[PDB]
Amino acid sequence: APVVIILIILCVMAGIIGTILLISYSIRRLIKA
Amino acid sequence: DAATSFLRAARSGNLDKALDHLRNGVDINTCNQNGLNGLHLASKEGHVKMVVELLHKEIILETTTKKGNTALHIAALAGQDEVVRELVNYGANVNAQSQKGFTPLYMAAQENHLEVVKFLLENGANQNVATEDGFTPLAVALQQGHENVVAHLINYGTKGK
Amino acid sequence: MRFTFPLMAIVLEIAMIVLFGLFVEYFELYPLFQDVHVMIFVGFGFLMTFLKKYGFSSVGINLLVAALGLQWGTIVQGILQSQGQKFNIGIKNMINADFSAATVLISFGAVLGKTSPTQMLIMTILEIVFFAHNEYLVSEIFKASDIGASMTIHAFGAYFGLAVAGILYRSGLRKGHENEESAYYSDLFAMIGTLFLWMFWPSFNSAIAEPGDKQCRAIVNTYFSLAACVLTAFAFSSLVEHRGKLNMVHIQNATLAGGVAVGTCADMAIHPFGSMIIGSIAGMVSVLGYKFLTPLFTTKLRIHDTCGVHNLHGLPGVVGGLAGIVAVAMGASNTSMAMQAAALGSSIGTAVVGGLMTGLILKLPLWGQPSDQNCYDDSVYWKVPKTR
Amino acid sequence: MRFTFPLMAIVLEIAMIVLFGLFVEYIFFELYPLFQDVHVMIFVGFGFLMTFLKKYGFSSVGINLLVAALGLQWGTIVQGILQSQGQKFNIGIKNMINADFSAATVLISFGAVLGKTSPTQMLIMTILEIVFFAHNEYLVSEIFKASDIGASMTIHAFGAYFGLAVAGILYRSGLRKGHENEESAYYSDLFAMIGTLFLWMFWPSFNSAIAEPGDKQCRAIVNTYFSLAACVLTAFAFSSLVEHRGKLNMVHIQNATLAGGVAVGTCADMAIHPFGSMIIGSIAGMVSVLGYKFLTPLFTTKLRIHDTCGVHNLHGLPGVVGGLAGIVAVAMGASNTSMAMQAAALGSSIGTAVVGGLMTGLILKLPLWGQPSDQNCYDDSVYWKVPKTR
Amino acid sequence: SSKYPRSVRRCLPLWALTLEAALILLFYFFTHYDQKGLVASYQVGQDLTVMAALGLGFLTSNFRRHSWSSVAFNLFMLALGVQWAILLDGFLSQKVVITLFSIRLATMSAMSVLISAGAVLGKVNLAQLVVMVLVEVTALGTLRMVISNIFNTDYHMNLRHFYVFAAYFGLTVAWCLPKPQRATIPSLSAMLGALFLWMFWPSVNSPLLRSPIQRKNAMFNTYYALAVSVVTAISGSSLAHPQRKISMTYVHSAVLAGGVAVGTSCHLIPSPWLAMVLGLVAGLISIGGAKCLPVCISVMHSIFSLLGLLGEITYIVLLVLHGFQVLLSIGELSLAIVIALTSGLLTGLLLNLKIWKAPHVAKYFDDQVFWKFPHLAVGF
DSSP: OOOOOOOHHHHHHHHHHHHHHHHHHHHHHHHHO | OOOHHHHHHHHHHHHHHHHHHHHTTTTTOOOOTTTOOOHHHHHHHTTTHHHHHHHHTTTTTOOOOTTTOOOHHHHHHHHHHHHHHHHHHTTTOTTTOOEEEEEEEEHHHTTTTTHHHHHHHHHHHOOOOOOTTTTOOOHHHHHHTTTHHHHHHHTTOOOOO | OTTTTHHHHHHHHHHHHHHHHHHHOOOSSHHHHHHHHHHHIIIHHHTTTTTTHHHHHHHHHHHHHHHHHHHHHHHHHHHHTTTTSOOOOOHHHHHHHHHHHHHHHHHHHOOOOOOHHHHHHHHHHHHHHHHHHHHIIIIIIIOOOOOOOOIIIHHHHHHHHHHHHHHTOOOOTTTTOSSSOOOHHHHHHHHHHHHHHHHHHHHHHHSSOOTTTTHHHHHHHHHHHHHHHHHHHHHHOOOEEEEEEOHHHHHGGGGHHHHHTTSSSSSSSOOHHHHHHHHHHHHHHHIIIIIIIIHHHHHHSSOOSSSSSIIIIIHHEEEHHHHHHHHHHHTTTTOOOHHHHHHHHHHHHHHHHHHHHHHHHHHHHTOOOOSTTTTTGGTTTBBBOOOO | SHHHHHHHHHHHHHHHHHHHHHEEOOOOOHHHHHHHHHHHHIIHHHHHHHHTTOHHHHHHHHHHHHHHHHHHHHHHHHHHHHHHHSSSEEOHHHHHHHHHHHHHHHHHHHHTTTOOOOOOHHHHHHHHHHHHHHHHHIIIIISSOOTTOOOOIIIHHHHHHHHHHHHHHHGGGGGGGGGGTSSHHHHHHHHHHHHHHHHHHHHHHHHHHHTTTTHHHHHHHHHHHHHHHHHHHHHHHHHHHGGGGGOHHHHHHHHHHHHHHTTSTTTTSOOOOHHHHHHHHHHHHHHHHHIIIIHHHHHHHTTTOOOOHHIIIIIIIHHHHHHHHHHHHHHTTTSOOOOHHHHHHHHHHHHHHHHHHHHHHHHHTTSOOOOOOOOTOGGGGBBBBBOOOO | OOSSSSOOTTHHHHHHHHHHHHHHHHHHHHHHHOOOTTHHHHHHHOOOOHHIIIHHHHHHTBBOHHHHHHHOOOHHHHHHHHHHHHHHHHHHTOOOOHHHHHHHHHHHHHHHHHHHGGGTTTTHEEEEEHHHHHHHHHHHHHHHHHHHHHHOOOOTTTGGGGHHHHHHHHHHHTTSSSOOOBBBHHHHHHHHHHHHHHHHHHTSSSSSSOOOHHHHHHHHHHHHHHHHHHHHHHHHHHTTTTTTBBOOHHHHHTHHHHHHHTTTTTTTTTTTHHHHHHHHHHHHHHHHHOOOOOOOOOHHHHHHHHHHHHHHHOOOOHHOOOOOOHHHHHHHHHHHHHHHHHHOOOOOOOHTTGGOOOOOGGGOOOOGGTBSSSSSOOOO
């Protein structure tokens, strides 16, 4: 159960960072062209 | 045994024992396992009389060791001012380079031997000769903090011989 | 992107604040904590300042990594000890958080000069997760004695860093780098970290030791192990160097190997003679590792270790684990043989696997990794003054 | 002239000896480690933090030692006299800790005028500022009865605004567009990092030394610890944000990373929770970095207040944030004491610091203390034998 | 002779490894291990360790090109000296039981050698320092044993003479050596070392005191005495300097003036004003020593010797208030000086032996003699 909570926290942080980077990369590829 | 005794006498400065071995027939050009002959060993220890006597008996002045060091290289690294002067007076090449590209000036400068540096410069040592690392005598004295040497090398610049 | 690092720092700090709000609630060990604190922030950070053009990054990224690490390690270790429940914070929680920071800094020593601060934040998070899980496994499942943490901190951090550095291998740096060189005053500054680590290591190995005989032995055994380690490290540096000259790399690092190798046996009744034996062997092993195994790892195994953490933390940590096993063999401790061996194996294996996964994540070209020519240079991430 | 500095120091020392003989007589060992940490903060942390100047390291660390060595004695005397109301008193570990606190206030003020003053000027500043600081800290602790266990207002805000007032009075026209010697160097910055790290590590002892043993002292230690941890992250993030091309600035890393320890001071012993301490630390680091980038350039050029170490961005603004945080904490119910009394302590701290700093700077502005010229500012060679080799 | 240093690739490792193996064997054959204030007691010895390794280690790092050797050789000397002092204090005061108090006392004995070595640092290699450590620890232990046998005092309490013993031993050893500078960054590192010594010197003045009120008063007196000295030093450095500037090197030695002056009498001084008076007088004597001693090798060790003698003299003056004891204490002081001088002479003639491969007099104060540097020609 503590392992599940720690993995959940890591998943939340990874998802936040990945979504922000994906949005930034999509905006960059739409904007440069 | 005879060659080993002669080299030991040359290292210790026992000129009489070394002069005896040459009378008895010990070749003057014999060297130890490191390639150092009697002239190299005398130059290391500052034995000026032994150096002169060996030069008179026709030792090869530009013989290099297994590291490529001449007698002038060893005398400059050991800081033997009188031996350096005597070797230069008999025609030692002041611009000789060892296997790794060191000159007598580089060895004198890295070791803060100001008198040897001044004498080698007055004898036409070119301070632009770099080693395989690209280092000059000026560069090594800066790294090692040798400020008296750094001053003399820059202030001489190229007064040449 | 120049905004990746501030974004990740702010997001991680906000996550830390939220996790503390969700999980965290509110004096004889405080001086030992402060000793460990000085070891974490002054010791490692200034120990890594030997690089001539990477001192700013060394000390500053040490501070940043350890500051993030204490918070994240507090959260993870507390969650493990509380099984997902709320937990209180004492001096022991702060000490253990500093220990997690120490593990991450040991791994940082392997990748120093080739990684970005963003990569360091990511490595801090992932490595603390892996380290805390392995340390919980050793302490509660195996119930092995590792009071000085030769296995759970030093060996783990070293092999985690080695796995990361192996994944992050650059072909252009195998033969060397012009920035990868020390300076005179840089080595003088590194001596500060060396001396503080040496002076305060007895508190490192005895902070969470059981009060009474164990804590006293942890202090006495660490002290004499370091005393023997200094002499043997000096002796072996001269023996492996031309004309017997001392190498500052050896005197900066191998002098501390006795503290690492005595950690498992610190609290055990091994006696002050046995602690000195361990320290001497640690110093010898560390010097031999720097001179012969680090070139072998860099050139042949393609594992470049900037600070030689394999020689200070990895090999001495393994030696400490083996010393713990042998001490169990001869009655110095009541812990089992198999549990000490399993702790050593689990620490090394978990470190390698976690380092592989973390390095695979760090290899994505999203973190502003320096170019090959720009490695070991402060100017990639810092404003550098014009004069030294 | 030639003997002003030694004569003033010997007269001050003889006065200290006479006052100690007239007023001073002889829990200690429990509080001694915390005092040792505070002592290291005073003499190594503050001293080496200011050694970032490339030609002023000797004067930085050495004048830090002179001021603090004098300040501990003078603060002992003044604080003991104020506490005992003119009677003979016995000194314990609390007296040493409070004297080192007074020295810390004087060193914070010294950070504003670093490189533009003489040792004689700093002797006079130490003597006057300790009187002003001790009178205010007695007003805030004994008359207003405010809770400032980490001294965000009484030490940090007071010292910073006292130094700002002195620097404003001692303003030099020929130093508003900069000075060649005002600049850091690589190894000077590494020494500054030594000072920064020692301050950062030992700040929990700084904030918990006078705290009530038990829950309050432990709360102060934990709050300072986690506030500093959060402050480092936000200082690094905003240093990357505000600089050109995202490069980190050693000024920010050296100073703004202590803003969390400065700002958590009033709320240190209060039950704000560790998470609340982290929020204060994160804001403190943000505010310190933004102050260093935007506020200091404006204060120096528009306001004619040159502050060498940026002590306004580390002690001034974070000190006011800490006092305000303490007011919000009483409103939240975290603390005893009234809102009005916390507000009184913040206003008293700044007002006293500005008035006392104005009078002290007017005394220091006299051409009798051998203050350097605009050309010789930030140069050790005015007062020290400097080696030829760096 | 050859100014290029002789290879120590067979001397230094064999010497150090043999020393460590002998120490391990002796610890096996003679030493044994075995509460509430464990951490409190550990703190004093830890303070002494910080003052030995960091304080004295960096205090002598002010040399432009010998900072590496100063710091690292001090670390080596401390590590050897603590072990040897443990064994020798065990042998000359009784199996040897290793407690934290015994480690603290061994650290004090090692600090004696570390103080003495400042007079010879930059002119010796590591093997000569090993010889100095061994002989000086032996001489200090012998001096303490002789005092304990003659004047019937405790062997451990005789370690109060360590300031003056270290000063005179170092002076004699330096006098016996062959006859022969600063930089800014090494000077700042030396300021770090000096600051740590000055901040923790109240621990030097009360490790041997058991009664808590005695330790309290000793630390009080040391703290206030050290405070007055710093002011007298930085203030009076200008007077005792030809160009009327403050000297960093003078400050590094003179801050410790009050601590040395009240070291033997800190627990006896009843009021802080007397400790402050002694600190002021010590600072003034330090200024005078700086202005006068070079006229009549290391000036800082000379003024330290004067300060230690002053500390013993003020102990004699204060002990009467708290005439046979005067004669006995003068005799103890003179026996300490005589033994320090004789043992320093013996060490100096031992260090002059050719077998140690000492650096050439032209190669003093230089790290390149002992350490590996890049881009250097090596060998012949």
